[PDB]
Design a protein around this ligand. Structure first.
Ligand SMILES: Nc1ncnc2c1ncn2[C@@H]1O[C@H](COP(=O)(O)OP(=O)(O)OP(=O)(O)O)[C@@H](O)[C@H]1O
Ligand SMILES: Nc1ncnc2c1ncn2[C@@H]1O[C@H](COP(=O)(O)OP(=O)(O)OP(=O)(O)O)[C@@H](O)[C@H]1O
Ligand SMILES: Nc1ncnc2c1ncn2[C@@H]1O[C@H](COP(=O)(O)OP(=O)(O)OP(=O)(O)O)[C@@H](O)[C@H]1O
Ligand SMILES: Nc1ccn([C@@H]2O[C@H](COP(=O)(O)OP(=O)(O)OP(=O)(O)O)[C@@H](O)C2(F)F)c(=O)n1
Ligand SMILES: Nc1ccn([C@@H]2O[C@H](COP(=O)(O)OP(=O)(O)OP(=O)(O)O)[C@@H](O)C2(F)F)c(=O)n1
Ligand SMILES: Nc1ccn([C@@H]2O[C@H](COP(=O)(O)OP(=O)(O)OP(=O)(O)O)[C@@H](O)C2(F)F)c(=O)n1
Ligand code: NA
Ligand code: NA
Ligand code: NA
Ligand code: NA
Ligand code: NA
Ligand code: NA
Lengths: 535, 535, 535
């Protein structure tokens, strides 16, 4: 069977729901038994998000293969069970970098290297590479139609549609249908103008996804159909919803997947969304409520912790608990003290880099440990927990990471090459990215929760637990719950004299889904519920 | 000095606030002592709105000279004291009608008559004729930039800017800056795309009026300025406000009138908005509250009663009464009965044509009269009041208008040329439009409200009170309060055994302003307040 | 079966060949046995070209039914045998006139009359009415894609394509592919930009007709196809040719009619272009050469005499005579005298209105008569011939038309209602338009040329031969060769003491075709050939 492509574009505005819409449509098609995948084409010049600030861009998502990618690939993995890799995300930067290397080498044989065909050919080659061996490939085009930055992507997919044929390619265009308070009407005019802009680049949209703060009524959908060369049944209402997990159902009920399967001549059973119906049911019917403090250094942009916030929500679903997530600036713990950590049923310290706000997180880890408040530490969260214990239990004064204080006496966290003891004595690829097997210690809390001896979780860090100083911290009562590799690096630590204290080096939020949840976050939210009840 | 033009255009959507923004800016310039006028260019093909139904594009406004115009001219008269005429409003229909007339009789001397220059020349001639010897002329262009229907208007004003020069012409462009709930940000992208659309038509905007449901922050305004070749100070925030009377102050506070006066080299004093501050103060400081029911056949589109709704609010300002306007379908009175007129402090029956919903209005007038509930009838409102009194007091069974039942025994309302008595005996440009003198009767409510023997009000009707059946209705207790012309046509009637029952042929709502109010509406709202307390 | 539409548009420039391309394609489809018609949509505001001067947009063509139309309908009748009528040509003026008429009398029932749907509906109705029960209807859109004036036509045909469906609608778009002298290459960039402009209006072209001063090579056609979403085989080369009669063959050789018949599912035999091959053969194989002078007042724009120039060429085909047409200003005859009529084998004085250049034509008719030079006078050409003979043979000094000198003693030409003799004595819809029967006199040139007692030819004139002064001119030797109607109006005159002197009221050029020729023009060109040899 020929691979089919759905090119997903956005008009009028960004922040429109392109990624969620693509992920939601992919979920419907996977629920019909189809082999589906999604890829994100980002128009920014960064070769990849590896170097990009969480505050500016949102979280850096990590795939099994260790690619640093757009957070949209997080949405993809939470909506479909196809595993994402490097091939599922690429930037304008990547494309120009590759073409420039081929040019400077001499691969183009003295030819003038042009946006067309050289840049467009490089785009098409990466789309085909990502799409090969799937029934349906959804290709999310970042940016807004009419902007300079996405034109090469739009010209590339236009060429692909002609080459491959309209029997195996569809253009799905999102637009904004805004509400005007004064007249009490939703407005199709931006959709009319956006479709003309998309046509002016050479693309006739097949499907229009109308985003609005309410349902787009039949009169407005008919008006959009009339002006845009699109049949009325291919003009789809996608209103603002209180849960994105409802969107697969909303799109199915408007026959979007029927329309797509008809165009692609795919004979497949009706979409079974029973698992999504269960997720929606669980979320709408919590029995208890908990407040969980997320104490970090990037709270000014919540999307910095997209996968963590979702993983906590998924913890709620499995326990039938409504999780109130309180984003707390760790620098406010440094300034105003531990007073701002009161009325929390649990505390989570997520990932981060740089010393700014870290002392606040160390204080937070101490507060949670001493007051028996459920604690989950992720990467930096497990560093500050180890530092807390080293300082305040093992009596290793001013214990720190070499990242923050390079020449500290007790570098409990440091690079493998930097490993030294308190006397400066030493033993006789630094960045860990992507999936790695971790061995769980018998009788550990995590061994019970994961219900297995070994687990596969994803890393994004280079600063490790210093094995030379570990024995002293272990003797002071701290437990090693997980290890990995030949160098037996510490992956998980637990404080046993505590209802629920777990900290891990890996990013468990990256394997959490609404349908399958996550053993660690489910345990954490349960502990939060049990704590809330005891008060 | 040379006449200055401000061309006001709208992008992204209609219902944007072009009329209110133009009127509000004109109010600031008038408060600086400038001779200012406004005109509306409507892209619809109707020669004028005389033929258009109210539920289509709102009320048909009537000027002193009897022109049937866009309701925007109502906004203009409520914001500036410059009186509107036929030359302050014209349509595409009017332009093509005039050019086709000239062409068919041979005025173009065998020339090919073209959109340019013949249609655009006709537009420029009407703009100049309406612009006269004013200091500043605001020219509001109907429709949305990028649509087919407004392109001749836009090409015309582009040519005017070049001819007159940019020292005496400004382009003021309104755009939508919508709020995205999920991201919590207002979006400048529609403004960016709309300005490029306006530029592609040959117009560089000088001023951007950014419409949003909240203030457009400095960052967003600075971004708009960066992409649109517009100075940051010429990017103006116009949020949704609870009162349009506040808009002159909000525009002044951002220096819009300073920018305009600087560009036009107009040395005039700072705007004194004391009159608007007073209107706002009155509105914000009511003493009591009333619920006035408006019972009509066009309530599905409130803009059908734009001037009447505003006139009732002005009535409130003058009494410090907060008027809750309840729009009631007259057909619901026919179905569900008088029960839906309960809990009303007053009843207004406004203008209308056709028999649909009229019997409900006659029932409504009966209820108001019999239960001593304050009543104001405008045009059709007076007809139904005369029919009510004819049927139920003067014992003229099945009394009606010839408009509704042509061959009724008692045509109490009819064309002057249809006037007959109950036996079919007779006496011996029916359409009355615009300002006409009315003589008031010595001992009437209206004589003491207007405090003058004669008044000037505006008509839009052909169906008159039948003088042949009047004397019998007068004997039954109905009072004629106002008459006009050689044919002594009945203009105002009153039911004297009632706290406040007045009904007029003319449209008093067209001469009501927020600053000067209206004697009749002030009296009506006062009567409503007295009934409210009395109960 | 369902009627099929080919919408013919032009990009980049006007004067592109839309009319000739449409007519040429229609000739191929007719040669496949298809029932085919063509209509012209003109974006000018003139209700019809009746009022337009010839020097503006060329000759006013007249159909059988007396419609005054664009000269394109002349191209249509010269290429297909389907007779044109009023419904094969309409203007923006006609559309707005009709919609304004309907609106003012209340046919739209209080609706806001808009470009869409009211103007576009009116366009679609006239296209369908003209399209009738034909197999294929070619719809030529005047103006250039991207201009304001054609946007309603383009929106209308876009809606038709959607409604009727793409199985019965094709978009054929003409573009300019200009030659750059310095680089020696033809440029596809204007085609690329024009197609994007057409797409931005909502129309994807199916066929691209590439106009150039030479063949568009495979590389350029392949490039156009790549950027325009058009199959390579649907990119057609239409070079500048020495004969428009070759165009049907050139389009057929590139498979254009095959592509169209495949898209429309039309099973019809291969086009037999034998009739066109014969015309081309005749044209390429002349035996002798003649110089015919055309003496008129509109020679500044040759298209003023489009049909007359073509009719003379058709006269050449039928005699195997190469006709060198010399355009001579009749005002130059007034200034420089008869000297500029030297070296002419024949003289044609065509139609015209107004006195400017008429005396030069009268002098021209005198020269042709006195020096036995073959003469054909059409309409004004006959008037000046009658005036010439009246003045210089019948001794009616200062004899003239009432059009030129209203109060002349001998008004030999005048309106029927102005008919008076030399003493001022009298007898007892003046505008004659379209096909009218003419009775020919037994012993006349025309009776033996037409070989019938009656003929049908087309009129466009109000000024008639004065029957009151005719008898005196007949006595002086002038022969009446043709008459018509109850008023026995003079249609044809001959000077019998002359090798070939004929002049007619009607426009015989409007019934001349390259395939069937015309008996009068064939005779005229033969007489020219005989004079050439005789000299
Ligand atoms: N139907 C919806 N209802 C409510 N929120 C939604 C809906 N669709 C998307 N969202 C939310 O809107 C935000 C943006 O969605 P998403 O990232 O998919 O859009 P996008 O077009 O890819 O944006 P950008 O390209 O600017 O990153 C997210 O917070 C997402 O959860
Ligand atoms: N700043 C504002 N705050 C609140 N309401 C507003 C504001 N400006 C305009 N409105 C309201 O919005 C509606 C449309 O205003 P207006 O008629 O001026 O717009 P417009 O662009 O001329 O509309 P249209 O093109 O549809 O005729 C009216 O109800 C008006 O009162
Ligand atoms: N292939 C061709 N070779 C030579 N001359 C041509 C060709 N096609 C058209 N012409 C000539 O070009 C001129 C314009 O042709 P035509 O009237 O069909 O164009 P058009 O696009 O309809 O023009 P306009 O829009 O200005 O009315 C005429 O003189 C015609 O004979
Ligand atoms: N390409 C187009 C499309 C439309 N229009 C003209 O657009 C006008 C309607 O303008 P509105 O009411 O603001 O727009 P709406 O389409 O209803 O969209 P919304 O859903 O945002 O309200 C018609 O007169 C027209 F004529 F139809 C136009 O001139 N050119
Ligand atoms: N003409 C332009 C303008 C911008 N951009 C690109 O637009 C991108 C930003 O997209 P966003 O965040 O949706 O746009 P915003 O301007 O901030 O508008 P909003 O106020 O609606 O959020 C940049 O990468 C860019 F590169 F700047 C572009 O490609 N071409
Ligand atoms: N939509 C497009 C299309 C092309 N190009 C760029 O256009 C460039 C080529 O420019 P040229 O040589 O003038 O264009 P040609 O297409 O060959 O047209 P002509 O037949 O008139 O010569 C490439 O670098 C490009 F990159 F291909 C572009 O930037 N955007
Ligand atoms: Na996104
Ligand atoms: Na609308
Ligand atoms: Na308005
Ligand atoms: Na932005
Ligand atoms: Na033509
Ligand atoms: Na080139």
């Amino acid at each position: 069977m020929t691979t089919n492509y759905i090119f997903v574009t956005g008009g009028v505005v960004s922040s429109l729901g392109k990624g969620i819409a693509a992920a939601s449509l992919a979920a419907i098609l996977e629920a019909r038994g189809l082999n589906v995948t999604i890829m994100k084409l980002d128009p920014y010049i960064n070769v990849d998000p590896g170097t990009m600030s969480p505050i500016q861009h949102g979280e850096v998502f990590v795939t099994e293969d260790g690619a640093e990618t757009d957070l949209d690939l997080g949405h993809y993995e939470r909506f479909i069970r196809t595993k994402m890799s490097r091939r599922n995300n690429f930037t304008t930067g990547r494309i120009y970098s590759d073409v420039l290397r081929k040019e400077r080498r001499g691969d183009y044989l003295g030819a003038t290297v042009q946006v067309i065909p050289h840049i467009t050919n490089a785009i098409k080659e990466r789309v085909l590479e990502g799409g090969e061996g799937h029934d349906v490939v959804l290709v999310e085009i970042g940016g807004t139609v009419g902007d300079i930055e996405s034109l090469p992507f739009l010209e590339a997919i236009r060429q692909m549609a002609v080459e491959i044929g309209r029997e195996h390619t569809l253009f799905m265009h999102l637009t904004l249908v805004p509400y005007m308070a004064a007249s009490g009407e939703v407005k199709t005019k931006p959709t009319q103008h956006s479709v003309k802009e998309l046509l002016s680049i050479g693309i006739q949209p097949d499907i229009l996804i109308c985003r609005s703060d309410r349902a787009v009524p039949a009169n407005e959908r008919a008006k959009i159909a009339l002006f845009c060369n699109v049949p009325e049944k291919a003009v789809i209402s996608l209103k603002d919803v209180d849960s994105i997990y409802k969107i697969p159902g909303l799109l199915k009920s408007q026959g979007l997947d029927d329309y797509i399967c008809k165009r692609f001549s795919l004979n497949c059973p009706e979409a079974n969304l029973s698992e999504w119906e269960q997720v929606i049911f669980e979320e709408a019917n919590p029995v208890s409520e908990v407040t969980i403090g997320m104490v970090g250094k990037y709270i000014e942009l919540p999307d910095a912790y997209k996968s963590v916030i979702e993983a906590l929500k998924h913890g709620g679903l499995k326990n039938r608990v409504s999780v109130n997530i309180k984003l707390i600036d760790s620098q406010d713990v440094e300034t105003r003290g531990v007073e701002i950590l009161k009325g929390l049923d649990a505390i989570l310290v997520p990932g981060g880099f740089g010393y700014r706000g870290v002392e606040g997180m160390i204080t937070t880890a101490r507060f949670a440990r001493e007051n028996n408040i459920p604690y989950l530490g992720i990467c930096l969260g497990m560093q500050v927990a180890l530092i807390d214990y080293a300082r305040h239990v093992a009596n290793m004064e001013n214990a720190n990471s070499t990242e923050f204080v390079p020449d500290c006496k007790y570098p409990v966290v440091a690079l493998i090459t930097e490993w030294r003891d308190e006397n400066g004595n030493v033993e006789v690829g630094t960045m860990r990215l992507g999936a790695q097997q971790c061995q769980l210690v018998d009788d550990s809390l995590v061994r019970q929760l994961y219900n297995a001896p070994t687990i596969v979780e994803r890393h994004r860090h280079r600063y490790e637990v210093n094995n030379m100083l570990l024995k002293q911290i272990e003797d002071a009562g701290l437990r090693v719950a997980g290890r990995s590799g030949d160098d037996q690096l510490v992956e998980i630590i637990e404080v046993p004299n505590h209802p629920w204290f777990v900290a891990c080096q890996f990013h468990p939020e990256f394997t959490s889904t609404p349908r399958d949840g996550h053993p660690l976050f489910a345990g954490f939210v349960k502990a939060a519920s049990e704590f809330q009840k005891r008060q």
